[model samples]
Target chain A: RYDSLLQALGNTPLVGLQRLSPRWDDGRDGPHVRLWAKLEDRNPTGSIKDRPAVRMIEQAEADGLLRPGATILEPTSGNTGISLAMAARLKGYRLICVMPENTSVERRQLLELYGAQIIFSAVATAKELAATNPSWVMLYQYGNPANTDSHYCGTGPELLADLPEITHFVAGLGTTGTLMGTGRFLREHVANVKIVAAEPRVPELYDPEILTARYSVGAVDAVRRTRELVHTEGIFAGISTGAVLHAALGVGAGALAAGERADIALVVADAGWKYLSTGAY
Target chain B: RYDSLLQALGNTPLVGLQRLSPRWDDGRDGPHVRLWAKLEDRNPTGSIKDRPAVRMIEQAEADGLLRPGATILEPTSGNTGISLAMAARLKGYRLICVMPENTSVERRQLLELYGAQIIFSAAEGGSNTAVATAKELAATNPSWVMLYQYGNPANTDSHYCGTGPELLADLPEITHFVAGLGTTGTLMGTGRFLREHVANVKIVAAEPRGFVPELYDPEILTARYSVGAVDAVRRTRELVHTEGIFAGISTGAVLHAALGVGAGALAAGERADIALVVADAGWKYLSTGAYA
Candidate 1:
C-alpha cells in the first residue's frame, strides 16, 4: 500500500539529544534538562520549510490568486526555495527562486529538476530585491505575512495540540517566522509558557543577538515589543534560531530551579546541514 | 494542520512533455504519442526509488527483520542507496551501501550526510556483482537483511499499487509503454495494469543491445536474469547506440526500443496515441559520458 513519494515529507520523530554536552541529569538541575530536536530535516525536501511552502501555495490556489500556467517566485536562503520549487512544480505552476549566491549545489539541482529558475542575489543582504521582477509573483518569505500565517495556522496549532503542556519553546531565528508564529499561538493558550529564541553568538558580543537591539526588522520589532524575550548563552543555534533557543532554555532552567514544573522543551529550527559550507556546524 | 516533515515524500506529479516532437496531427504514424514523465526525481531525496526504499525499511522493521540500532546493508547504483540511507538515518538505523566505485559525487555526499558507511565494488562490473557481494557478506553477518530489491515484492508492489494507478489516472489513453530495464518492477506492475485495463495496449521493453534476448551470461547482462513478469514479454527489442540517446546502458536500450516502435508505427501510417518511458538517474551514467 505504499503510495507516491510526496506522502513522506512530514511528521518527523521528536527525539531527546542525550549525547549533547549539557546532559539531562534529574538529581542536579531540579528536573533533568532534556534537549529535544524535532528532526525537520527528515522532510521530503530535506527541511522544515516544506510545511509552510505547501500550505502557502495551497492557500493561494484556494483563494484564486494562483492560476494555471502562472509562475510562483520566492526569495529564500535555500530550504524555502527548495520547498516552493518542489510544491509549485507538482501543482503545475512554473517556479522561480531568488536566493543568495552561496546556496549549496544540491539545493540548486533539486530546484532545477522541478523546473524552477533560480536567480542569485549578490550577497545575503535583504536589500537585493532585483529578483522580484514584474513577470513573477514573489513569495517573499522574509517580509510576506503569509510566512508567519502559514505557521500560525498550521505548524503552531498542530504542535500545541500535540503537546498541550509544553513548558518551553526553543527555536532558531532565520526570519523569526517559526518562533513568532508558534510563540504567538502558544502564549494565547498557555499564559505562563516560556518562549526562548536561539541565535548563533556574534563573535565579539558576550550576549546573543536575539536579546540585543540588533534584530531583523520584521520579527525583531515583534520580539522587542513582546514580554517573552529572555536571553542567555551556551545554547547556540543558527544565528537567529540560536538567539531564540538560548533565551527559551534559560527561562526553562530558571523555572525548573524555582520549583516550577517544566515538562518539555521543543526546538523548532533545524541544524546547520544546509549551511555546512558556512562552517556554522 | 502541519505536523512533522516526514509526511511529504511520494505523491509526485505526472506531467506531459508537450515540448517534444512527432505530433499525431502531422500524419506521421506512430502511436499518437503523448509522453508523460512521472517526476519521482522531485522526491525528497530526489528519485523515484525513495518509495520502495522507505517501504522496504518499514516492512522489514514490522516483520522483525530489522530492529532498532541494526545496521542495514544494500547494493545500489546511486538513487536507491541515497534514499535508503536517508530513511535509515531518520529511523535511527545504521546504513551501509555497497555501491560501484564509479557512483557519482552527489550520491556519495548524500549517503555520507545520512552517516552511511560505503563499500566500493568494481566499477567495470557494475551493480550486479555489488549486490551479490553484499548478499554474501550478509549471509556471514548475523544481523544483516540484504533487502534484495530485484526479488523484493515490495519494490514491485510499490509501483503496482501506487505509480501504476497514478500514471493511469493521469493519462487514461496511454497506449504503449517504454521503460529501462533495471529491477523491472516498473515494467511488471505497469505492464500488468495495461494488459488488464487497456486491451490493445502494447508493453515493449528496452534493454542494453546485447542484453535484450535471454542470455544467461552474467558478463553479458549485468543483472543475470529478468524478473518473472517481464520474461513473458515476446516483443522486446534492442536499442541502437547510433542515435546518441546515450543514457545508462539499459536506458539507452529502452529509448532505442521506444523510438523503434514509434518509427515503425509512423512508417506503417498508424497513429500512436501515447508513448511513455521511465527516466532513471542521469547522475549514475556520468562516467559513461552519457549525460554530457
Candidate 2:
C-alpha cells in the first residue's frame, strides 16, 4: 500500500528464468548456470526510467532548481519522457519534452497522454532553451549524477539483496545511468562481478572501467529474444529487455563454455504493452 | 523474489485518489471523504483475473481434475483468457479460449501472442454463444477442464484469500468496497470477508442479477448501480486525466460508483473511506475509441 504511485517506486520482483537458463540443473559433471530477471517493468510508469525520472526531479527540488509551478525541460523521445511526465504531473510541475520533429507519433501521443507538453526540436535547441529560460529547469538525465545515483543506491542494493550470489549484472545501455550506477555499486561489493552492457549507446555517465564486457545486440536479435522470453518464462517484457536478456545469455554461455557456475541477472526495462501496436507481437 | 510469474500473484498497491476524492483532508466544517484504488493491474498478467485464473487451475489440480499436460478450456473474450493463456503456458498446460468471432482484433492478437488457441463462437450470440460453445466442447472432450469462472468456487475463494486480506491489511478503516460486477466473485468473496470483519462496511456493485453467477450472493451487496457506456467512457477518461491511473473501461464505472458513495458520505457529513478495484490497465483498450 502506498499514498501515491510515486511512493510505489522500487522493490520489483526478481524471478528466476528456469526455462530460459542454459543449464538450470547442475549435472554430475558441471555446476548449474541460471538467469534471473529483475522486473523493473512493474514501476509506476511501467519502465526502469521511473527510478531516474523521480530521483532527478526530487534532486532538482533539493538543490533549489525546481520550485512550485516550475516548468521542467528534458530532451528525450523515449521512456524517460513518459516517466518524467507522470512524476512531474503528480508533483505539480509543468513539463516540456524536446524531441526530434521526426520522432514516432505513438511516442509523441503517449507523452502528451501523460500531460507533458512536447516541443519538437534538436537536442542542441533544448540546451539553448534551458540556458535562456530561467523558469525552465533541465534535469538532464544523460549527465545528471542523480540518474546514476538512483541505480547505485536503489537498484544495485536491491539486486544484490535479492540475488546475493549474483555473478553478472546485465542491462541495455541508453542514458548509461543503469549500467554505470548499478555496475559501480556491484563491483564495490561483489568480489569479481561482471558488468555487461547491451546497447541499442550512450556516454556522459559511461565509465568503461566498470564494465567487464559489453555486448551489442541488433534489433532482430532483440525482437527474437523478446518473443522467446514471453514464450519460455511467461514474462512479457519490452524489446529493450530482450536486448539485455541476449547479453545475459551470452554471459551465461561464456561461463558454461569455461565450465563455471553463473547466476546472471538482467533488467526488464518495461513490459510489451507499448509495443503491441507495433505488430511485433 | 519468486520462482515464476505464477508465484507473483497478489499484494497489489493500494493508492489514494487525492485529485478525485471529494475531501482528502478533514476540514473544520466536516470529516473527510476519500477514495482509494487497489491496483490489481500490477498482477502477473496485468489483470485482477490472474488471481482467479491461477486459483481455478490450482483448485482443479488439487482435486485431481487436471493432470500433467492437460488442456484447460475457458470462455472469455477479455482479461480472463489472457491470464489463463499466460498461466497455462507457464504451467505446461494447453489452453483454448472460446470467444465471439467479432471480438476485437487487438484482443485476438494478444490472446494468440500469449499462446492460447482460439475457437470462435457465432458473432450474433455474442458471449452467450461462446459460453454455450465452451460447455459443449467440455462435454464432448471430457478430458478438457473448463474451470468455468462463473461457477467455480475457486473464483470466489481467490478473492477471499488474496484480494480480501490485502484490502483489509492496507485499508482496515475501509467503509465501502466498490467493485465492478464480472463473475461477481469479487463482490461475493471480498464482500463476505469485509462484512464479516468491518461489521458495517458497505459492499457496492457497479452492475446486476437473477440468471446470476453461482458465485453471486445478493445479500452480500449493499447497493447496485448501473452505468451506461457513455458514463463509463467519460469516467474512464476522467480517471487518467485527473489521477494518472490509466485503467480499463470497467474501472471507470467502479470509480463512478466510488465517487457516488463519497458524495453521499459528504452530504450526510459522515467520514468515508472507499476502496475501489482497478481490474486492469488501459493498454488492452487503447485500440478502442475510449482513449482517442
Candidate 3:
C-alpha cells in the first residue's frame, strides 16, 4: 500500500503489443520486430507529465524556491496542468494554469477538480505574471532541468531495465524532455539505439543531435491510429500517443525491411478520457 | 509488463487515505482509525466490473455456452458494458449493451469507441428497468446471449477469488469492508469470504437507491446505509479534495458508509481500519454536474 498517490508516480507498465507488432515471433516470419508500449497513462494523474510535474515541485522545494503554501504557475492545456494541480494541492501549494481560450471544458473541469485556478492566455502572459509576482513561481516545463531529469533518472532507467534489448525509443515531441533525457541515457548504454520523435519541442532542453529521426503525423492518421490502438491492443491512448505509435510502427517497418530483430518501445502519454470530448474516440 | 490488458485485471493499489482518516497517525493522541481505498479504477476498462466481465466471458467460453462469433448482450451501467466491449472485441465477439438513459454521455462515448451497440431503456427505473428490458429482449431473440451479472456465479466468484484475497493480503487487520451495493456481487462475494477469515469484521453496504439484487444475501451485511444523491455528490468532491482520489459517485456513497464505520469505531475507542472500493474513476461523470 502506498502512503500517497504521489509515491505512485513513475514505474508504469511496459506492455507488449502482440497483435500490433509486425512480427512478434520469428518462425515463418523473417525477423522478430515487436512494439512495446510504456503505459504512462497508469501514472497517478493518468499522464506522462506526472513524472515531470512532481519532479519539478520536488526540485523547487529542495532548491528553496518553493515553501509551504507557495503559488505555482505553469502554461499547459491538459495533462501537465492536471498533474501540477494534483501535486501542488497535496503539497499545500496554490496552482494557476495558463491555458489557451480554446481549451476543452473537460480539461478545465479536471483542473478545477484538483483546485487549480485557470487563466486564458499564452506562455508570455504566464512569464509576465510570474515576473510581476515574485512569490508566484513559474515551473517552466519547456526549459526546466528537472523535467528532463525526471525522464533521465526515472523513465529512462525503467525502460532500459524492462526491455534491455530496446532498439528504438519513440515519444511525442511536445516539451522534448521525454525524448532528450531518455534518448541521452539510452544512447549512452545501448549502441546504435534510435531515438525517434513523433508528431512534433522546447529550445533549452531540446537537443537535435540526440534524436536519430523525427516523423510528423497528421490529425487524420493520428485519430485513425488512436482508434486502431483501442480496437487491436486494448490501449485507449490519447492522440499524442497515437502519433508516437505511428512513428514506432514506421521504425518497426524499416527494421522489418532489413530482416533485423528490433525491439521498439513507445510512450503512451495519456489515456483517451481527456480526448472523449473532442469526438475523436 | 503484461501480455495483454485482460492479464492486468485485479491487484489494484491499496492506498492509505491519510487526510480523510479520523486519525492517520497513532501518536500521543489515541489509536489509529484510518480509511484505506482499494483503487479498482486502475483496471483496463477503468472500473471494477472488468473483473466480473472478463470472468463471465471466460466462464461462458469454458462452459461451452459461448462459441465462435457469439453475440453477447448484457444489462449494464456502462462500466460492465465497456469491460465486456473490450474483452468481447479482443476475443472475437459481438457485444450489445442495454443501459439506462440516465447514465452519463461519456459512457455512451466510450461504448461507441469500443464498438459496442447500445439500447437505452427508461431512466425512471434506472438499471432495474434496463435489466428488465434486456431480459425481454433476450426472451425474444434466442441468438442473443445474456450473461446476467446479478445472478451469475462468476460475478460473485470474481470478487471472492480476486478482490477478497487482494484485500486480505493488503490489509490483514482490516476491521470494516465497505462498498456500494450495485448488483450485490462485490459485497456478497467479498463479505462472505472476509467473514470466514477475519474475526468479527463488519461488512457494510451502501445502496444507491436500492433494489435488492439477485446475488444479495441480507445476512452477509452487518449494516446497510442509504446515501442521498446530495451526500454522495458532497463526498465525491471531498474525496478528491482530501485524499486526491477522483472517483465516481457510487464510490462516494461507499466512502460515506466507510466513514460511518470509522466514526462508530472512534466512538467506541477501538482501532479500526476501514477499506472501501473506488469502483471507477470520475471520467465518465465529468459531463455531469457531480463535480460542479
Candidate 4:
C-alpha cells in the first residue's frame, strides 16, 4: 500500500497469535494475556533491519553529511546488508558491504541479488580494510544514535499506536539498538511494561531481582522454536527470533498465564527467507 | 488484528502497483485505470482457501450441523488442508485431509505440523481424481462432513459475502474483478457480487484450455481468458522482480490475466481499476521452481 518501496518500510503487522498465547481471553470482555508477533518479516527485504538501515541513511542525508551518489558502508553479512542493498538500489546510493564468512550461502544469493556493488572481508580487517576499501564516510552502527532511534522514532511509535496496552516489549540484544531504544520508549510510556532482551553469548548479572527472571537459552533450542513457529503458526522466523521466542516462552508461561491480562509482544526481527537450508523447517 | 485467528481472514491489502501497471493513475479522485493486487497469500494459511475454509466451518456451525467434536473431511493437497487444519485445531474438530501423492515432502510435513490427519490419494488428472476418491470415502462414512469445496454453497457464500464486500469496500470504483476457476469459488461468487453492484463491471475467469464451467451465470461474463503454465510462470517471476511480490503460480496465472485487462484499458484510453486475486504462496508452490 505504498508508492515507493522505501516508504513501505514500517507499519508492519502487529498480529495477535491467539493460539500461542496461554490466555487470549481467559474469561473477560475487556482483557486477557495475549501473545502478539510484530511480523517484521512483512518488511521490504523481510527483516526488522530495514527500520534501522533506512533510518540511518535518511538521518545521514538529513544531517547533510551524505550527499547525492554517496557510498554507504556496513560490516554485516545478513539482514542489515540486504536492507541496505535494497536502499542503495532504489535510492541511488553506492553501497559497500563487508560479507562475513560465518553465515551460510543464502547471504551470497541475497547480496548478489540486490547490490549496486559489494565488498567481502575478514572479521579482523578494519583499519587497513578501510584504507583498501575507502569511502566518503561510514556511520558505524554500534554507537550511532540513528541506529538506536530507528526504533525510537519509528518502531516504538508504531507498536504504541497499534497496541498501546503493550505490557512487555521483547527483542534481540544484538547491537542493543532494538532493546535499548524500544525498551526505553515503552518504559517511558507504560511504567509497568517489562522489557526482555535475549542477549546472545552474554553472562547474566544473576541477582535475586535480575530485572526479569533468568533463563538459559541455547542455539539448539533456538532452532527448535524457529521450526516450531513455521509448523504451528505458519510464521517463517529466524534463529535469533526463535531464540528470543524460546526465552519468551520460558519466562512468560508462568508469569503471563497466571495474570488477569498480559500482552507479551515479541519482535520477529527476520524470517525463514534465508534459512531454507538446514532442513530445519 | 482480531479477537481470534478467524477474525483476521479477509481484510487483506489491495495494494496499487505503479511500476507493474500500464497506468496507476488514469485521472483525478479515484475513477482511474489502476492495477491492484488483493494479496490473498496474506491470509492465515497463506492462501485464498482460508476464506472458504473458515467460512465453511462457520457456516456448518451456524446451521447446527457441526459441533465441537464434529469430523471435517476434504481432499486437498495444499492450502485448503492447511487452512482446515488450523480452524479444526482451534475450534475443536477432527480434520481428515486426503492430499495427493504429487504433493512435496515439505507440504506433507507442513499439513501434519498443523494438526490434520492425512490420507494420500492418486494425483491424477489434476485434482478431479482426488475429488472422486474423496466422494467414495464420504459415501462410506455417512456422518463425515465432507465440506466439498467444489460444489459447496458455503464456499460460494464465503466469497459472496466476505470477498465481494471486501473488494468493493476497498475499491468502490472497481471496474473489473479477476480470479481463477480452480474451485470456481472465487470466479463464481465474487463474479456475481461485482456484477450486482456495478451493472457492467467485467468479470473474467482464467481457465486452462477446454475446461469451462456449466453452472455459473452466463450473463455475468466477458467470456473466459485462457492461460498456460509457461505463460503463468513467466508472469509470476515478472511480478516478483518488478513489484517485489513473491507469488505462487496460481496467482501468477491470475495476475497474467489482470495485466492483460489493464493493457486493454490503456490501449482504449479508458479508466479501469482491476483487482487480481493471489491464491497462495510459500510452501504451496515454491518447490516447483516457478520463481527461478
Write down the lDDT of every candidate, Cα atoms only.
0.55, 0.88, 0.89, 0.72
Q: Runs in model 1 with CA error above 4 Å? A: A1-141, A157-170, A185-196, A202-281, B1-47, B54-71, B86-94, B135-144, B161-180, B189-292
Q: Each model's fnat?
A: 0.00, 0.56, 0.66, 0.19
Candidate 4 lDDT by residue in tens digits, A150-244: 88777888888888887777777765677767766777787678878775552121212213433456778888888776655656577888888
Per-candidate TM equals: 0.56, 0.96, 0.97, 0.83
Give the per-residue lDDT of model 3 (tens digit) for A94-156.
999999987878899989999999989778989899999989999899999899999999999
Give every collision pair in model 4: B33-B272
Model 1 Cα shift for residue A239 (angstroms): 10
TM-score ranking from best candidate downward: 3, 2, 4, 1
Candidate 1: lDDT over CA atoms?
0.55
* A1-281: candidate 1 lDDT, tens digit per residue: 11223444455545443433133556644565554545464444556787677767766778777788788777677778777776665566787676787676545655664567888772333234435345455555665556666566755676666566566666666666666676677777876765565544411112232221222223443233111111111111223344444454555556566855564445535433343334333
Pick the winner on DockQ between candidates 2 and 4.
2
The residue-by-residue lDDT of candidate 1 on B108-167, one tens digit each, is 655665567899988876877787778778888968767777777677667667676776
Clashing residue pairs found in predicted model 3: none
Assess candidate 2 and give its TM-score to the true structure: 0.96
Badly placed stretches (over 4 Å) of model 4 are A4-9, A13-34, A54-77, A81-147, A200-216, A223-238, A253-261, A270-276, B25-32, B209-218, B282-284
Q: Could you give candidate 3's per-residue lDDT for residues B1-292 as a string of tens digits?
A: 7777788778888899988898888867678998989989888888999999999999999999898899999999899999999998778899999999988999999898888999999998888899989999999998988999989989999999999999999999989999988888899999989999999999999986545677888899999999998889999999998767789999999998888889887877889899999999998899887897
